[PDB]
Design an enzyme around this catalytic site. Structure first.
Site, short mmCIF file in Angstrom:
data_model
loop_
_atom_site.label_atom_id
_atom_site.label_comp_id
_atom_site.label_asym_id
_atom_site.label_seq_id
_atom_site.Cartn_x
_atom_site.Cartn_y
_atom_site.Cartn_z
N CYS A 136 -4.52 -2.40 3.96
CA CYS A 136 -3.66 -2.03 2.84
C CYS A 136 -4.46 -1.70 1.60
O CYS A 136 -4.11 -0.76 0.85
CB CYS A 136 -2.69 -3.13 2.50
SG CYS A 136 -1.57 -3.51 3.80
N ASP A 154 3.13 1.98 3.06
CA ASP A 154 4.29 1.11 3.09
C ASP A 154 5.44 1.75 2.31
O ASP A 154 6.60 1.69 2.72
CB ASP A 154 3.96 -0.24 2.46
CG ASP A 154 3.18 -1.13 3.37
OD1 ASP A 154 3.34 -1.03 4.58
OD2 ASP A 154 2.40 -1.95 2.87
N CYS A 199 0.79 -1.23 0.00
CA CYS A 199 0.00 0.00 0.00
C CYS A 199 0.82 1.27 0.00
O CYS A 199 2.08 1.26 0.11
CB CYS A 199 -0.95 -0.02 1.20
SG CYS A 199 -0.19 0.34 2.81
#
Ligand SMILES: [Br-]
EC number: 4.99.1.2
Length: 208
Positions: free
Chosen positions: A159, A99, A96
């Protein structure tokens, strides 16, 4: 904005299973090399019993494996996603948008990140280093956040709702159509990078 609720829930999810934080950073660094990571290799790096590595990983129910049972995805992944994370000419991927903002500080590398706006399909890209973002295109790039949930699948509950957008107003128009998502909020990519910095700061505290 007021991002304490997201920081808090992100940390609770790491702290929920003992050793998750201690295992995360070494695993990310090894995955960053662009090759599958075996459980035995991870044990060696952590100096843990195999039994210990295995228990932590079984709690991480979104972990991706290859045909040999090697790890190939844990936030950072070798399997293609919408979030391209390039480090010295190795194209890796991330689960995602957030991240991609967190990992550079944790692996000690600068990444060329690219994706598409989830509202309009417009290309988005930026350079993320351990300390800063640059080359933000468009300058007004935004990120969606939702609140993490306990005992929910992390990719499907978190995510997959944490995207890049071409702008905050574009993202806000999109968000008005998805108000069923718990804790849905739109922030600028700079605000999201700040959130990642606070996450990482707390994370490095949790570690032995
Ligand atoms: Br707050």
């Amino acid at each position: 904005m007021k991002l304490a609720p997201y920081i808090l829930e992100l940390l609770t999810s790491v702290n929920r299973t003992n050793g998750t934080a201690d295992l995360l950073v070494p695993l990310l660094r090894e995955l960053a090399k662009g090759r599958p990571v075996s459980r035995t290799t991870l044990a060696g790096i952590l100096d843990w019993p195999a039994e210990r590595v295995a228990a932590v990983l079984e709690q991480a129910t979104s972990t991706e494996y290859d045909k040999d049972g090697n790890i190939i995805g844990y936030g950072l992944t070798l399997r293609e996603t919408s979030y391209v994370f390039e480090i010295d000419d190795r194209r890796l991927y991330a689960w995602c948008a957030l991240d991609t903002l967190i990992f550079p500080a944790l692996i000690g590398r600068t990444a060329r990140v690219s994706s598409h706006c989830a509202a309009t399909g417009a290309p988005v890209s930026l350079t993320v280093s351990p300390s800063e973002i640059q080359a933000v295109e468009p300058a007004g790039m935004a990120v969606s956040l939702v609140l993490p949930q306990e005992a929910a699948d992390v990719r499907q509950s978190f995510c997959c709702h944490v995207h890049f957008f071409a702008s905050v107003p574009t993202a806000e128009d999109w968000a008005s159509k998805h108000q069923g998502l718990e804790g849905l909020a739109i922030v600028s990519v700079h605000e999201a990078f700040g959130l990642g910095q606070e996450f990482n700061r707390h994370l490095l505290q949790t570690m032995s």
